[PDB]
Design a protein around this ligand. Sequence first.
Ligand SMILES: CC(C)(COP(=O)(O)OP(=O)(O)OC[C@H]1O[C@@H](n2cnc3c(N)ncnc32)[C@H](O)[C@@H]1OP(=O)(O)O)[C@@H](O)C(=O)NCCC(=O)NCCS
Lengths: 6, 715, 179
Amino acid sequence: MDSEVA
Amino acid sequence: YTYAQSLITKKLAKSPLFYHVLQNEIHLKSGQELAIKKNLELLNRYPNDPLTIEKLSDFFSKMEMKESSLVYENAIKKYPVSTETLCLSWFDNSIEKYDFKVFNRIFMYLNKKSRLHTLWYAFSFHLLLQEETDKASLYNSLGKKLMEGLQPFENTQEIYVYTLFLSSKEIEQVLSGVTLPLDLELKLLYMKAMKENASFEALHAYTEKLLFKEKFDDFDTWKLWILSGKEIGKSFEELDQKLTLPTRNISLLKIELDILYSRNIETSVENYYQKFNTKLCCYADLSQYELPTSFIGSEENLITVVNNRKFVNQTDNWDVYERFSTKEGAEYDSNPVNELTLRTIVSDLDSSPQNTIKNIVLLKHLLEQDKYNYKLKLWLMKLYSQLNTNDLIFPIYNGLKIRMTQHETLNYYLTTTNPSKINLDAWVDIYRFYLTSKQEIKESIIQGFDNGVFNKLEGFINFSKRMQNSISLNFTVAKILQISTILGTDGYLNYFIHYLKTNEALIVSDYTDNRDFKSEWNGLEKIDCIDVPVNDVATKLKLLVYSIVFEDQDASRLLKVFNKITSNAKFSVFDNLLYKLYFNLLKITKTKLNPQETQSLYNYLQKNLKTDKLKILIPENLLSGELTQNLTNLVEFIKIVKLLAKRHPSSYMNQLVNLVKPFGKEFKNLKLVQRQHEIIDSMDFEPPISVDISQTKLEIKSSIEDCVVALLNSL
Amino acid sequence: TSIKPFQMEDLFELNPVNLDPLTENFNVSFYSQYLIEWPQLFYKSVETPNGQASGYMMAKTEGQLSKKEWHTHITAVTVLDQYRRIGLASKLCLELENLTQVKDTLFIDLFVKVTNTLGRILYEKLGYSVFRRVVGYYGREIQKDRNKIDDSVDAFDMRKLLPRENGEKVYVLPNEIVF
Ligand SMILES: CC(C)(COP(=O)(O)OP(=O)(O)OC[C@H]1O[C@@H](n2cnc3c(N)ncnc32)[C@H](O)[C@@H]1OP(=O)(O)O)[C@@H](O)C(=O)NCCC(=O)NCCS
């Protein structure tokens, strides 16, 4: 999963 | 909050600038605190160089209590290129922080050359002097030599600031030598100086020119003229023969001139009366002096009857009223007869509910014709504050067109109003006044300095100071928090919790009082009487209660303050119970205690959160407004119990929330409205005039029912 | 009785004068701005006994001399009810004509409620003439027909010429008075 802050 | 933090790190990474780092440190402070103070101190050790950055760092150090000053001082020394913009920033930033003490320090850097800025520096030495008797002489001497450095002075404002550092004997020599035409400010000071210095030959000459050649007609100046005259030897006749015209000022001066030459007063007193009995000012003027026996010895003119009755101090005046009950003259004027009717009503007030209700009918009756009589309106509000008729005061208040600064001096008339959403909105709007006036006075102080108006700057400064933390400001916040939590609405609740958390230093200090307890007494003698039921200490305690409810780190400090205040409180029996309940409830929920301490405090809450105990909140006179005022406070307490059981859930809190479920039905069975209706229905009035009692009875009954029931439905 | 300069803190004690129905209570901004920009044209009358405020004059200077419109304006006069009918408001308005700063201007301006009987009597005796009727000047609703006059909200702009029209029927709207 990547993450929100991106 | 947390998305702001990730945003700030993004920014700091990109910079990898100063203003962003500061903002991040501030967030870390909010989230947390020592971490942030370290970060800020680290940032201060690095040479702050940007204006906005340096401004934010100074505000951070003011928040956490001498490092804010040292942010700007560093920047000023290390980059003198910008020293003026840095100083002006510091100045504006200091006015907004109500930090008036630092002014001299800013002005010193900013002077080390503009002439206006020298004036600022000098003026600031006066402002310091208006606080430390050990350094008085040095400050006075410093500002004095600053102003001598600027001679010749160019205007009366410069001259004014010079006088701030001069003795009375220096002031007279300076002003006698001024080439510029003096303003009124300085003329008064010149005369003050000459009177204090017994320079009477000079005084008499100066006043003669003003009064006679200039036809100034100033009573204060007239008094200095006859005083200077006797001292330089002139006789009664030489002065009196110069007093021809029958102006109001000269007529009264003849009395003052008789007094000064120990001559007999009666002829001058009778001459004034015969010339001014047709004017409403007559009584206030002659009441200044010791009027002779014989003059009290002594119609087609109402104002003459008014005066004469006031001279004889006549308490019953209803005869005159039916002669002149009909409003005549200009629409917007008042009926002078009601100077006497109001006198009779105030003398008849005896704080018993029947007398209150009777005098309400009378006041309402007189306002039917004297639509704009403000004193009747204020007294009518005062009588309504004695009962549970809580929704009847706001209409009178708004009809007076109370607005802006008047709220600060008069909003206490609304002390007993009911917690309706309509009133909440009115209260929020009063708060809007405080917000806007806060900004306007700050900008007016800045601009007063940018122009050269030292004549009025101390007034501006003190005006701001007196509004920063007044009981009227805090009562407004207490009210908004109370009504907000009583209803279900929270549109502004979070805003004002933030005000408390941001201003704890103010909240726990002594509040300034600018309230007007004088205006309803204008042209009467202030006897002891009924009062609007204010409770300033409770206002503080309430704000402390909410401050503690929403304390997230450590509630012990605020609770010591709370306990110190309640311990000296002077409360009634129920108010004492109520803040002990708050004490025990707050400490259970907001402080770490061991299982035994907790059970102890819980059992006190358990013992007394019962109607049989809280029944003591009900006054013996059921028609007293203490009833709803206490009820309101009980409702607010219960809401705070329920809020805390959510914020800090526990089995104990669950038992208290259950304990308070039956209160509503139980107090409803005390039949508080019915009993009040029964008392009113059994009152016999013989009013001193023909008035319809029934509509006031019907209005009062309906207002009592509506207000009590709304509180009872809130339990 | 005695006249003293106005200072901002006097607002805290002006209620007996400013609760009168024809006396407006302005923003802190407004009072202070006058004290900043025309400090000698804001002054008060005090009582004999305690220095109780009897009334005040709040005035300004405004306008372009090239446009013949450089004048002194009265934004507020009022006398405490106890001290009326004894020359006091006249003393306040005439003392204004005496100041050098006012003498420098061409005329004295003021608005008065059409329904305000005593204010009109005051300026009539002082030598003021009705220069124009300002339509809705004191009213909330901003209106476009100058002929929809309304005595409860309209104003008479009064002028008195100083040493340096002939209709009460010129209807003008508030936003055409610019200076
Ligand atoms: C209340 C008010 C009457 C006080 O004024 P004042 O200082 O008493 O005025 P004076 O007593 O000096 O008299 C001024 C002139 O007006 C006339 N006048 C004043 N009060 C009067 C009254 N009640 N009935 C009839 N005429 C009156 C007088 O004739 C007098 O001139 P004269 O006596 O030489 O003919 C009014 O002028 C005022 O100042 N109101 C303040 C608020 C307001 O209504 N308007 C604001 C100014 S636009």
